[PDB]
Amino acid sequence: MTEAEYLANYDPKAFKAQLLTVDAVLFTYHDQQLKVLLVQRSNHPFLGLWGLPGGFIDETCDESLEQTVLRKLAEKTAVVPPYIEQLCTVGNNSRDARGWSVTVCYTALMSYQACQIQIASVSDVKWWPLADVLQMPLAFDHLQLIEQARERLT
Amino acid sequence: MTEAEYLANYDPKAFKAQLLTVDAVLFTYHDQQLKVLLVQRSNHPFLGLWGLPGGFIDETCDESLEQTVLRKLAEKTAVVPPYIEQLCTVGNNSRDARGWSVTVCYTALMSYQACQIQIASVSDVKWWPLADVLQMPLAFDHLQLIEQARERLT
Numbered sequence: 001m002t003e004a005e006y007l008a009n010y011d012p013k014a015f016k017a018q019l020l021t022v023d024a025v026l027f028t029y030h031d032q033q034l035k036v037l038l039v040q041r042s043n044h045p046f047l048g049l050w051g052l053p054g055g056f057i058d059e060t061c062d063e064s065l066e067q068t069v070l071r072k073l074a075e076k077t078a079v080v081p082p083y084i085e086q087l088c089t090v091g092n093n094s095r096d097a098r099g100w101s102v103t104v105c106y107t108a109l110m111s112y113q114a115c116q117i118q119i120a121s122v123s124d125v126k127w128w129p130l131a132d133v134l135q136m137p138l139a140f141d142h143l144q145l146i147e148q149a150r151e152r153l154t
Numbered sequence: 155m156t157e158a159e160y161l162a163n164y165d166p167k168a169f170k171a172q173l174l175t176v177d178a179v180l181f182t183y184h185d186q187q188l189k190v191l192l193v194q195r196s197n198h199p200f201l202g203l204w205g206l207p208g209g210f211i212d213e214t215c216d217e218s219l220e221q222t223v224l225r226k227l228a229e230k231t232a233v234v235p236p237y238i239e240q241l242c243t244v245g246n247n248s249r250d251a252r253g254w255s256v257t258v259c260y261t262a263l264m265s266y267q268a269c270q271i272q273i274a275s276v277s278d279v280k281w282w283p284l285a286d287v288l289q290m291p292l293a294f295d296h297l298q299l300i301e302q303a304r305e306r307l308t
């Protein structure tokens with residue numbers, strides 16, 4: 001079989017796939033205070049809970065993960081960070097009840113920008129003071145990702 | 155719908171999935187040379203070319219990405235690195251001709267371990283001096299990953 005025939009014949013639907021997502025932890029100093037950007041979920045799982053602005057790749061427009069994360073942020077948040085840097089990738093069978101799951105987390109520290117929800121998948125968005133966040137119930141493992149992102153600040 | 159119900163009715167084949175893989179850049183210092191562990195591929199694409207040891211998740215035995223990468227290395231390489239670090243994640247529509255693709259690349263500097271092939275997706279394994287690697291075509295964007303890990307050393 002040749003390279004070309006293999007690619008013409010290749011079918012990924014022949015194989016079990018995992019969930020693939022991105023997440024962002026955006027930090028700011030606002031009113032002297034360290035704040036993190038959280039959205040309120042209007043989708044299951046963790047419906048009604050606050051967690052990080054994240055989401056699924058849309059091959060219809062996304063060239064890369066960087067585009068995905070920026071687009072999820074503008075959609076759920078209206079916030080566009082000055083840069084975005086990869087923080088860590090968490091991938092296992094327990095973090096997401098929907099199945100085996102991989103999320104690529106990003107982070108930035110930035111100046112305050114007012115936020116507004118711009119897509120139906122969330123019902124609120126707010127910069128929360130960090131201390132309040134650590135004692136909140138947050139979606140999935142978003143408390144860990146935030147904890148990891150805070151260590152990156154230091 | 156309740157959360158328990160949402161989870162029970164969840165079906166991923168409602169949605170397009172992306173390719174998800176791991177890769178590892180293992181370095182050693184041996185015979186006064188930085189070397190990187192490569193494998194000679196026996197699957198398309200880039201059949202017959204050298205590349206990193208990597209591959210697809212097996213939900214059957216892998217609880218985590220770390221477990222996936224460790225297994226791929228055992229199968230293709232017989233090497234069991236004494237530790238492993240996440241290097242970065244690359245996800246885009248160009249790097250793998252099979253489709254939109256995310257790889258999670260790991261790395262480690264370790265003392266030498268003899269390597270042998272233990273799975274048929276590979277036909278040779280070798281610890282390559284780094285200057286020789288510059289002289290070969292490597293599979294996908296693997297050279298980029300190697301160079302990234304190599305620069306991280308300093």
Ligand SMILES: Nc1ncnc2c1ncn2[C@@H]1O[C@H](COP(=O)(O)OP(=O)(O)OC[C@H]2O[C@@H](O)[C@H](O)[C@@H]2O)[C@@H](O)[C@H]1O
Pocket residue numbers: 019020021022023043044045052053054055056057095096101103121140166169170
């Ligand atoms: N496997 C999937 N692939 C692509 N699209 C999907 C998938 N599952 C659901 N969708 C679509 O996305 C919508 C959910 O969008 P969001 O609410 O933005 O997704 P969310 O539930 O936030 O999932 C992403 C979150 O999962 C966590 O693993 C990760 O931490 C990330 O925050 C659904 O209504 C559906 O239309």
Ligand SMILES: Nc1ncnc2c1ncn2[C@@H]1O[C@H](COP(=O)(O)OP(=O)(O)OC[C@H]2O[C@@H](O)[C@H](O)[C@@H]2O)[C@@H](O)[C@H]1O
Pocket residue numbers: 012015016173174175176177197198199206207208209210211249250255257275294
């Ligand atoms: N989408 C898929 N999902 C799961 N398994 C698959 C898929 N496509 C093929 N396979 C199975 O895995 C076999 C290929 O195994 P490997 O040779 O280990 O895969 P390889 O071609 O090296 O793919 C991994 C490589 O892709 C790159 O994007 C990435 O950098 C990584 O090194 C195939 O014959 C098939 O049985």
